[PDB]
């Protein structure tokens, strides 16, 4: 349904809100999500220290947890809580996954520099010499 | 060495340059990288369609490729090409990995909505009803 | 049901058809799949550039996409399109996953040779010497 | 060096030899590898039941093992044993990884058929009806 | 439901039973599981050599297999067989995943020692010297 | 070298010490490790909140970090710190990886029970009925 467009709008809203860049009733949902987060996020991290996705997370785990959100009934408030929870999950996941990805590539580059390139750089006057030439 | 601080500066420069947000001689390197990219990136994607990292990429593959960059000697130009290559690798990797991550979480949420929540939403007047109440 | 035997037959048919080796109504399905592919695959890659599986693809993503294949109704033609889509997905996935796997092992071997073995090989007359002896 | 072309030739030789399809001194190496395998593979699986790669295998593990192959010296025979070992590793890895990949996609398809498609198929005369029409 | 508490109890029972440490009707289920395992596990490994999880196993594969356990009907015996199967799956998965994890970290440490530390250790009298000092 | 036997002994010592079960100078190293941990682990978690391995951690990251342990020289104390660090890394990694693995399998089982089995269980008197029969 348009449920996915709803989800996508909420997720990109929350992501851009926390300062992540990559380049209808949706409004009411954005605002209710904000309101919820402003009221309840201290009230949700003391037993909610889960935070993070692993690349091998199954949908069934997600389902079980959110199931305990809806165990004794669906109202609009817990739907909002659901969206907010998904958004927090998203923000955290991309945060840490981006840390590890960039860290991996940076580590690789540092390694290659230190093995194959630093000798030459030392026998040619170091980076100083560089900024002289291609400065 | 300070090689890693160099690498990190270049990577965050290139990432923020392509519009990715998450919240010395470094200058000469930034500029030489830019210059290189402005001169050679059409000249590098016709046999350079590799682009992407897999979560199971080994450093040895990276090493072999960059090795073919330095096969017959190290000069400053190919060092710059090395940094630029690493930056392109980074940008592409985070781009696509972020697409798949966010897509996964969004798919999960859409699924849960459509299985456990949409019935109730239909028996309570739909999202219209929602924007009436928590509007 | 026998749905899985159907699926498996179609997948191995399509894989062996594209030249991949590893060592009923099924016929009508093979032929309809072929026919479909002969009619529509230029008509499916301009907005269908997805191609590839990641080891961390969820069933929910697959479900959402194929859902947009069946959004306004099931007929036999879109069932055939479904099978063909699955087969294309399979072929592409194994193609690229095999590239990266073999590339990883090959890179490892090249590395080990170049670190631990090439010295000795150079102090014993090189591979020429080898083909003299164990030739 | 040309070490990688050596490795690649040996790997594709061994893979095509075991019947896997995807579409110099190399000869002496192919033959010595064959000879080795014909002499020693019963002599190598009783304490060599390792077989398989995981997507998260490090080069360091590979290095340690092959290190125990070369612990007290490099001769041509153990170089050949090295290539043969790498080839066996490759063949096994692609074998099992292909099993799990194809099995995953097939399982997905079976699932989707059984949830979204089989009802309709039952209300339209089943696959028999299909082979009548698009036969 | 309390189905998950059931599952969790059975899994931790079976894990602690095989000697894995990490720090109601449940009883009847534990005992029936034991009884089942004592009667049928030779009768289940000749065509049941699957054993292992990959980090990229989908729930759909699990579902298909267990589906063939329940193909022609649910009775209590096959429910017990289901729990026992899940427990075996668990034990095997953690066994092998723990082997590979610990092996990876150990390999890393061995590598670092042999590259950065062993020189110094040799120029300072070796580990003997160590047990003299911090003994 | 025997460096790996050293590493393995230390790792299994530390793991069994924290209560994990799976079924020379080594002593001086065990004791020095213990001593170190008793003196410094409050002094190491305020800027050392890293803890965890991802299945896609490269050796190069490990190398860079431990490199900052040895930046201005190798003495025996920092070798001990190295072993202790590796052991902590191991314990944490297996802890959390075991949590997620067992949680995944348990979630799968709960799901299957709730979809395919719970209906039948409700039409046959529930688990009470079970403990009557196979009690």
Author numbering:
A (entry chain A), B (entry chain A), C (entry chain A), D (entry chain A), E (entry chain A), F (entry chain A): 3 to 25, 85 to 196
Sentences from the paper on this structure:
The Bcl-2 family of proteins is a key apoptotic regulator in response to a wide variety of stimuli perturbing cellular homeostasis. The antiapoptotic Bcl-2 proteins interact with the proapoptotic Bcl-2 family members and prevent the formation of an oligomeric pore in the mitochondrial outer membrane (MOM). In contrast, Bcl-xL primarily resides in the mitochondrial outer membrane with the C-terminal helix embedded at the mitochondrial membrane and induces small, transient alterations of the membrane permeability without affecting consequences for the MOMP12. Apart from modulating MOMP directly, the Bcl-2 family proteins and Bcl-xL in particular regulate the calcium homeostasis through interactions with Voltage Gated Anion Channel (VDAC), a MOM protein.
